[PDB]
Scaffold this active site. Sequence first.
Site, PDB file in Angstrom:
ATOM      1  N   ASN A   8      57.853  28.045  -5.040  1.00  0.00           N
ATOM      2  CA  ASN A   8      56.671  28.008  -5.864  1.00  0.00           C
ATOM      3  C   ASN A   8      55.632  28.799  -5.064  1.00  0.00           C
ATOM      4  OD1 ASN A   8      54.372  27.387  -7.282  1.00  0.00           O
ATOM      5  ND2 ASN A   8      54.371  25.203  -6.817  1.00  0.00           N
ATOM      6  N   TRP A   9      55.363  30.050  -5.460  1.00  0.00           N
ATOM      7  CA  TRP A   9      54.390  30.893  -4.736  1.00  0.00           C
ATOM      8  C   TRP A   9      52.947  30.524  -4.979  1.00  0.00           C
ATOM      9  CZ3 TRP A   9      56.097  36.739  -5.263  1.00  0.00           C
ATOM     10  CH2 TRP A   9      57.462  36.832  -5.005  1.00  0.00           C
ATOM     11  N   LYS A  10      52.712  29.765  -6.047  1.00  0.00           N
ATOM     12  CA  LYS A  10      51.374  29.320  -6.430  1.00  0.00           C
ATOM     13  C   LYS A  10      50.412  30.455  -6.754  1.00  0.00           C
ATOM     14  CE  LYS A  10      51.880  24.967  -4.216  1.00  0.00           C
ATOM     15  NZ  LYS A  10      51.400  23.977  -3.209  1.00  0.00           N
ATOM     16  N   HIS A  96      53.341  19.999 -12.306  1.00  0.00           N
ATOM     17  CA  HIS A  96      52.996  20.083 -10.907  1.00  0.00           C
ATOM     18  C   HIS A  96      51.728  19.289 -10.583  1.00  0.00           C
ATOM     19  CE1 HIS A  96      52.104  21.745  -6.956  1.00  0.00           C
ATOM     20  NE2 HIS A  96      53.401  21.998  -6.899  1.00  0.00           N
ATOM     21  N   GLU A  98      49.204  19.799  -8.946  1.00  0.00           N
ATOM     22  CA  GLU A  98      47.964  20.579  -8.959  1.00  0.00           C
ATOM     23  C   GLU A  98      47.398  20.770 -10.363  1.00  0.00           C
ATOM     24  OE1 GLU A  98      49.046  24.145  -6.651  1.00  0.00           O
ATOM     25  OE2 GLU A  98      49.428  22.869  -4.922  1.00  0.00           O
ATOM     26  N   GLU A 168      57.410  15.007  -5.877  1.00  0.00           N
ATOM     27  CA  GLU A 168      56.308  15.395  -5.011  1.00  0.00           C
ATOM     28  C   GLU A 168      55.620  14.243  -4.290  1.00  0.00           C
ATOM     29  OE1 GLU A 168      54.149  17.611  -8.336  1.00  0.00           O
ATOM     30  OE2 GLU A 168      53.721  18.818  -6.533  1.00  0.00           O
ATOM     31  N   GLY A 174      49.004  17.057   4.806  1.00  0.00           N
ATOM     32  CA  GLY A 174      47.892  17.254   5.723  1.00  0.00           C
ATOM     33  C   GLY A 174      47.114  16.007   6.127  1.00  0.00           C
ATOM     34  N   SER A 213      56.979  18.644   2.237  1.00  0.00           N
ATOM     35  CA  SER A 213      56.900  19.749   3.181  1.00  0.00           C
ATOM     36  C   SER A 213      58.210  19.907   3.941  1.00  0.00           C
ATOM     37  CB  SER A 213      55.750  19.543   4.159  1.00  0.00           C
ATOM     38  OG  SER A 213      55.842  20.451   5.251  1.00  0.00           O
ATOM     39  N   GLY A 234      56.933  25.179  -1.114  1.00  0.00           N
ATOM     40  CA  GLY A 234      55.582  25.684  -1.178  1.00  0.00           C
ATOM     41  C   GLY A 234      55.342  26.774  -0.141  1.00  0.00           C
ATOM     42  N   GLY A 235      54.639  26.487   0.958  1.00  0.00           N
ATOM     43  CA  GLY A 235      54.361  27.509   1.966  1.00  0.00           C
ATOM     44  C   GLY A 235      55.517  28.355   2.509  1.00  0.00           C
TER      45      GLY A 235
END
Lengths: 254, 255
Positions: A8-10, A96, A98, A168, A174, A213, A234-235
């Site tokens: 998922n490049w977002k 998602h 977000e 998710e 974080g 993550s 994700g990242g």
Amino acid sequence: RHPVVMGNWKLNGSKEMVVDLLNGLNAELEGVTGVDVAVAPPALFVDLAERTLTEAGSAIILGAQNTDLNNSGAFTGDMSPAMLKEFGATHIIIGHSERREYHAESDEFVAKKFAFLKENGLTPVLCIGESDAQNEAGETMAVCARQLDAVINTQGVEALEGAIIAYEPIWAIGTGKAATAEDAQRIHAQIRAHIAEKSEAVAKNVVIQYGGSVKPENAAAYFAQPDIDGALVGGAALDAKSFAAIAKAAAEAK
Amino acid sequence: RHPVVMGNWKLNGSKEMVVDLLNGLNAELEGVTGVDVAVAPPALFVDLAERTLTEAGSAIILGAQNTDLNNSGAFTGDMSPAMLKEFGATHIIIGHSERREYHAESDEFVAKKFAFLKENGLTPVLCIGESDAQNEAGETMAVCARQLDAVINTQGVEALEGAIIAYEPIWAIGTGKAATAEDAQRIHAQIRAHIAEKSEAVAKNVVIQYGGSVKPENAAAYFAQPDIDGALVGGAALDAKSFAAIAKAAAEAKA
């Protein structure tokens, strides 16, 4: 259950990057059989992605980060399944965390999307997951059961037929908090079980990716669990090396 | 004020259609130079749109149908002003009635997008307009002023400098009523006069497009009014011969 790893490049992409990344990606994954690798770039870059992969003769699947509820019409600004189909896209991230948070997408809204995608011959990648407070409260499954039933209790268990579910752990992220491969498996077993209650055939077959993550040196600890079938990355998806790594780990590990 | 005619293609587009439309359109506008013609295709086709216009050396302006509030980051499925700038898209429609209704976008949200567009160097096409019941209740200006103030009261009238405003008579849309060049002209002068109460300079120069149903048969009627500076076209945008006819009438009306 064939593992599926999606990136998922977002909200990241540029004309140079898209080409670089997809080429690097293709290189790294050259003949890395065993997994299904998919990319979800911003809608503005679906055209480029398609062209780059097609030149490359690549096997990477093309996806997109959301959909709307109509194929054409007076819907200024909407995302159409029929239009996405013209570029080969087929795996559509819906629900998602977000979009749910920022765009206030609801269980019923996301469920309608689920149904429409399926109606269009596309593959939904339904995201579910609990908050920090729903987690402190020990309500993880209440929430996941809820988000999942909005589909099952309308369309019916079968509906998850050939769909991907992505869990998710919103509570982690974080916030000093972390999910372990044990937590992940714990949770994925409960979800599958919830599905196994209406149908065991469906349950044993449904790909259930882990959306936490995951990094190159996490990947195999995760892909080891029997109920984790891949990852919605994700990242790491933004780096060809790291992402190919995660893809490889799942291929063998499985 | 130099007229601007923008075609909002809505949920319409296809690989074959995007190039046929842009190519025929550009052929039709051959000697035309007194109108800015913008086109807003679905995000999925902004790249193809650029490729076609570039190959043709076209002068048609590229825009998009919406934007979000971030350039990059963790916002799955959002629209980025910076990514839009890469394809050369400048005119960005925000506040469209279909978004305000179907996606419940507030004036606060829409106003935030206006500031962000200005922050990134793009041209916002700010849509405003009242519904049937508000128009019947005759509150057209309270609604319009409310919606324009969202940006004026938080950013200053000068924020409209370089922007485009499109009045959408939503009450006329899908509900048996009809706007006339005369009713339209009356609403645009009230809108302009509201902006002028804060700044005459800004008000004199702002392009206020007419967003009702414009067609090649009724266009010269509208572009004839002194306060109608162009149109934000829907359905007639989907045909090169119809859309070019509306662009031409605007060109002559304002020469």
